[PDB]
Design a protein around this ligand. Structure first.
Ligand SMILES: Nc1nc2c(ncn2[C@@H]2O[C@H](COP(=O)(O)OP(=O)(O)O)[C@@H](O)[C@H]2O)c(=O)[nH]1
Ligand SMILES: O=c1[nH]cnc2c1ncn2[C@@H]1O[C@H](COP(=O)(O)O)[C@@H](O)[C@H]1O
Ligand SMILES: O=CN(O)CC(=O)O
Ligand SMILES: [Mg+2]
Length: 431
């Protein structure tokens, strides 16, 4: 179909960046619809590495116009940082990036608050990325937050900012006993780049409506993952935006009836960064092996990611929540050499029940134990393989099994971090 959504079906870091960069070869637009610079992606073209955060993963292609929808919480500082980085490398961001006037702005006091609140929580700290996402979403929802559209009137923005900062500073110093964040500093920093920012502003809703009528291939790119969703994730150990497919319409302005194919990025094993339930988490040698072989360290905070087996019970939650059309299995190559691979097929509740559905809030996950199916692993190298025939039968079985257990076809298989090390069995666009 024309409108294809690409999002994470686990806890983020499944390989969205690469897959979006690969697939956008036929796309006209690429849209970020939620999150902020909390995300981190690594694209790799012929060995050249690119780490993105706020900017969409279709920025390396000139034929594509990258858009960051209203659902995104925009950090002026963060954007500029990535802009210069990409520009010095020959990628003209200003020319291929459009942004929404509705996008809320992430200013310094948000990071201060984020750190403050995270400290206050103490032992039950969420383990947030420390980029001010939560507080940004908060001001938005409260209706006191600033959006890109405010910047258009430098006078009143300065005024509006003045009061909001008084507001936050009061609690920052009084309640949290933390240092105040200087207004003038925020005003100067922000004013220093306003003209650049405002130049990329477009009416993205109306635009996507127009693109739709023309039949333009559009790709929506999700940040984070399903189980990190504000409503449906392992609350409160989640991010403050709807990471699920429903965030596409709220976060871009496109009517929900116009989603043709939701491609779910599924990693061959699981990882999670930050606090929260993780039924299949491995603390043993295999965990170390997985972490090591998959270079599992957060591309935004550098933090070592928690690792574990693929959880089909949890993945099945992503299926229904996102209305998955197909899966893209990433990192199959990381399992090379394992004597055996296991996939969680059911949960054993703390009261004795065997269930194949997921608990909601984090608390209700507390004594939940995983029930596995153990399949033989494979010694053969699958790295860089671009054809199923190069895959050992075990790997093929592992693949068939996942499809069986989920009811969703694995339409794409990734065998390496490079754009070309992939197998496209069915293209979301012409399917
Ligand atoms: N071995 C291997 N590495 C991969 C593959 N796909 C992606 N990677 C790398 O694995 C990581 C995926 O994590 P991350 O970048 O945070 O994913 P994202 O946030 O969903 O875009 C990145 O460092 C990629 O460069 C794959 O198929 N195999
Ligand atoms: O892009 C991401 N990838 C993986 N984990 C993330 C990402 N963004 C946030 N998190 C996690 O989401 C939770 C809340 O963090 P926040 O979004 O920084 O406020 C923490 O568990 C973070 O580690
Ligand atoms: O790509 C995002 N990271 O893995 C999150 C982090 O660095 O905490
Ligand atoms: Mg990431």
């Amino acid at each position: 179909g024309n409108n294809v959504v690409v999002l994470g079906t686990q806890w983020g870091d499944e390989g969205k960046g690469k897959i979006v960069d690969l697939l956008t070869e036929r796309a006209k637009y690429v849209v970020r619809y939620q999150g902020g610079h909390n995300a981190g992606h690594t694209l790799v073209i012929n060995g050249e590495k690119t780490v993105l955060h706020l900017i969409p993963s279709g920025i390396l292609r000139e034929n594509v116009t990258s858009i960051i929808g209203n659902g995104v919480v925009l950090s002026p500082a963060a954007l500029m940082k990535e802009m210069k980085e990409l520009e010095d490398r020959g990628i003209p961001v200003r020319e291929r990036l459009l942004l929404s006037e509705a996008c809320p702005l992430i200013l310094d006091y948000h990071v201060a608050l984020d750190n403050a609140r995270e400290k206050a929580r103490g032992a039950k700290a969420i383990g947030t990325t420390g980029r001010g996402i939560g507080p940004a979403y908060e001001d938005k929802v409260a209706r006191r937050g600033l959006r890109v559209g405010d910047l258009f009137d430098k006078e009143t923005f300065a005024e509006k900012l003045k009061e909001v900062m008084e507001y936050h500073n009061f609690q920052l110093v009084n309640y949290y006993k933390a240092e105040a964040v200087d207004y003038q500093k925020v005003l100067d920093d922000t004013m220093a780049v306003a003209d650049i920012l405002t130049s990329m502003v477009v009416d993205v809703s109306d635009l996507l409506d127009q693109a739709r009528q023309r039949g333009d291939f559009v790709m929506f790119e999700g940040a984070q993952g399903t189980l990190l969703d504000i409503d449906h994730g392992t609350y409160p150990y989640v991010t403050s935006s709807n990471t699920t497919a429903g965030g596409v319409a709220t976060g871009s302005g496109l009517g929900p009836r116009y989603v043709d194919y939701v491609l779910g990025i599924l990693k061959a094993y699981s990882t999670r960064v930050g606090a929260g339930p993780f039924p299949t988490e491995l603390f043993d040698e295999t965990g170390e092996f997985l972490c090591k072989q998959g270079n599992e360290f957060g591309a935004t905070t550098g933090r070592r990611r928690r690792t574990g087996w693929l959880d089909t019970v949890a993945v099945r939650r992503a299926v229904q929540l996102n209305s998955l059309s197909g899966f893209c299995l990433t990192k199959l190559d990381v399992l090379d050499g394992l004597k055996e691979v296991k996939l969680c097929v059911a949960y054993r509740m703390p009261d004795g029940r065997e269930v194949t559905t997921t608990p909601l809030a984090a608390d209700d996950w507390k004594g939940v134990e995983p029930i596995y199916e153990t399949m033989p692993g494979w010694s053969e190298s699958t790295f860089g393989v671009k054809d199923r025939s190069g895959l050992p039968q075990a790997a093929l079985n592992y693949i068939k099994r996942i499809e069986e257990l989920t009811g969703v076809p694995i339409d794409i298989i990734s065998t390496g971090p490079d754009r070309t090390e992939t197998m496209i069995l069915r293209d979301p666009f012409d399917a």
